[PDB]
Amino acid sequence: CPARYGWDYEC
Amino acid sequence: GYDNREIVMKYIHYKLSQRGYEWDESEVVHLTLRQAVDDFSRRYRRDFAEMSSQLHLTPFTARGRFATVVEELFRDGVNWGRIVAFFEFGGVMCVESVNREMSPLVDNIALWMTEYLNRHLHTWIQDNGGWDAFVELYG
């Protein structure tokens, strides 16, 4: 998904 | 095999015990969640703090506060980092409920987390390698 949290960049 | 309700309740049970409160495999998954929340606490503390901010809790606003946070978390998709954050958020809500003399809300929060997992998260988990995919990395 659109990264809105730091953990989104790992996924 | 696991039970989503068992996982939610072990996690909440653990987080309450951390803060000195006594309430009342799925175990391996609960332990995986603790490892992942610990990991994220060292790297995404600002994101955890920003989600837990604006938690002004009253029994008649508890559900609406839960729904707003969790619906914003997953509105444009589900990933494993958002599942970790969902657990952290529900745990924090449970300990804040006890700190503010609203201990009846703990089992409601466990129910809202269980329904939300089952209705909105479970199919994504199953389509993306099951709980095993997560346990494999953090177990």
Residue numbers in the entry:
A (entry chain B): 1 to 11
B (entry chain A): 8 to 31, 89 to 203
Question: What does the study report here?
Answer:
The anti-apoptotic (pro-survival) proteins of the BCL-2 family include BCL-2, BCL-XL, MCL-1, BCL-w and BFL-1/A1. These proteins bind to and sequester the apoptosis effectors, as well as the apoptosis sensitizers, BIM, BID, PUMA, NOXA, BAD, BMF, HRK and BIK5,6. An elongated hydrophobic groove is thus formed along the surface of BCL-2 and BCL-XL proteins, spanning approximately 20 Å to serve as the binding site for the amphipathic α-helical BH3 domains of their pro-apoptotic partners. Herein we present cyclic peptides (CPs) with nanomolar-level binding affinities to BCL-2 or BCL-XL, and further reveal the structural and functional mechanisms of how these CPs target two proteins in a fashion that is remarkably different from traditional small-molecule inhibitors.
As the long-term clinical application of venetoclax has caused an occurrence of drug-resistant BCL-2 mutations (such as G101V and D103Y), it is critical to seek for inhibitors potentially overcoming them and figure out the mechanism of action. To examine this hypothesis, we obtained the crystals of BCL-2 G101V mutant in complex with cp1 that diffracted to a high resolution (1.85 Å) in space group P21. The overall structure of BCL-2 G101V is similar to WT, except for the N-terminus of α4 helix, which is relatively far away from the cp1 binding site, and is likely not directly involved in the binding of cp1 to G101V mutant. The electron density of cp1 in BCL-2 G101V complex was also well defined, showing a highly similar conformation for cp1 as in the WT structure. However, the minimum distance between E152 and cp1 is about 7.7 Å, much further than those between E152 and venetoclax or S55746 in their complexes with BCL-2 G101V mutant, 3.3 Å and 3.9 Å, respectively. This distance difference suggests that the knock-on effect of G101V mutation on the adjacent E152, which accounts for its drug resistance to venetoclax or S55746 as previously illustrated, may not drastically impact the binding of cp1 to the BCL-2 G101V mutant. To confirm this, an SPR assay was conducted and the results showed that the affinity of cp1 to BCL-2 G101V mutant was 1.00 ± 0.13 μM (close to the 0.65 ± 0.14 μM for BCL-2 WT), indicating no drastic influence on cp1 binding. Interestingly, in the BCL-2 G101V-cp1 complex we found the conformational change of E152 residue may further lead to a 90° rotamer change of neighboring F112, as compared with its counterpart in the WT-cp1 complex. Probably as an accommodated move, the nearby F104 residue on α2 also shows a 90° rotamer change, which is not observed in the complex structures of BCL-2 WT-cp1, G101V-venetoclax and G101V-S55746. These results indicate that the BCL-2 mutation G101V may not only influence the conformation of E152 as previously reported, but also cause conformational changes of F112 and F104.
